[PDB]
């Protein structure tokens, strides 16, 4: 559980996100797969784009960015009350993608990076300790979530 002032900082960073979710979408997807090529393996051949000009120009890329984090800021604005808005997120992750815990904490880690890249100054040491117990309280409950699905994670 974080506490009030965890979830400010949290909140704070994330309105620097919200003003632009295309670009730190693409920065992130893109760090994800340079950091980690073989999650570039859960989604189908039909991408597997070869240059990061080929990944900044994919409007394919960029909109699905734009998923990714417009769930994420839902989940992390309701400060663990998260329930109603992470079980269809598990359901698909668990039995559709299969998408294991190990590959939600690669995504975690590029988040980070891109965060602490573009906001250093509203990303020091506590707001960084924030949004990672906040995170892991991601992973934790989707883990859970996993669990009661039949999806060992
Ligand atoms: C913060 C973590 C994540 C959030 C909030 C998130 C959310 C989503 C959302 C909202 C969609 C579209 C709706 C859906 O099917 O559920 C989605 C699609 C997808 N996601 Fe995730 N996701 C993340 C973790 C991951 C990771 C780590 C991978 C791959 C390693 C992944 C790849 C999957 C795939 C394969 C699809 C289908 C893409 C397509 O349309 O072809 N996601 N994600
Ligand atoms: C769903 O579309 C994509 C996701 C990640 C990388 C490239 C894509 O076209």
Redesign the pocket.
């Known amino acids: 559980v974080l506490s009030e002032g965890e979830w400010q900082l949290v909140l704070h960073v994330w309105a620097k996100v919200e003003a632009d979710v295309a670009g730190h979408g693409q920065d992130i997807?893109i760090r994800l797969?340079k950091s980690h090529p073989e999650t570039?393996e859960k989604?189908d051949r039909?991408?597997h784009?070869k240059t990061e000009a080929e990944?900044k120009a994919?409007e394919?890329?960029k909109?699905?960015g734009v998923t990714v984090l417009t769930a994420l800021g839902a989940i992390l604005k309701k400060k663990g009350h998260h329930e109603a808005e992470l079980k269809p997120l598990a359901q698909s992750h668990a039995t559709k993608h299969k998408i294991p815990i190990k590959y939600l904490e690669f995504i975690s880690e590029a988040i980070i990076h891109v965060l602490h890249s573009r906001h250093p100054g509203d990303f020091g040491a506590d707001a960084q300790g924030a949004m990672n117990k906040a995170l892991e309280l991601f992973r934790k409950d989707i883990a859970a979530k996993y669990k009661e699905l039949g999806y060992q994670g």
Do not use: A, T
Request: aromatic share 16%; glycine share 0%; hydrophobic share 45%.
């Open positions: 997807l797969f570039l989604y039909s991408k784009l990944m994919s394919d890329l909109k699905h």
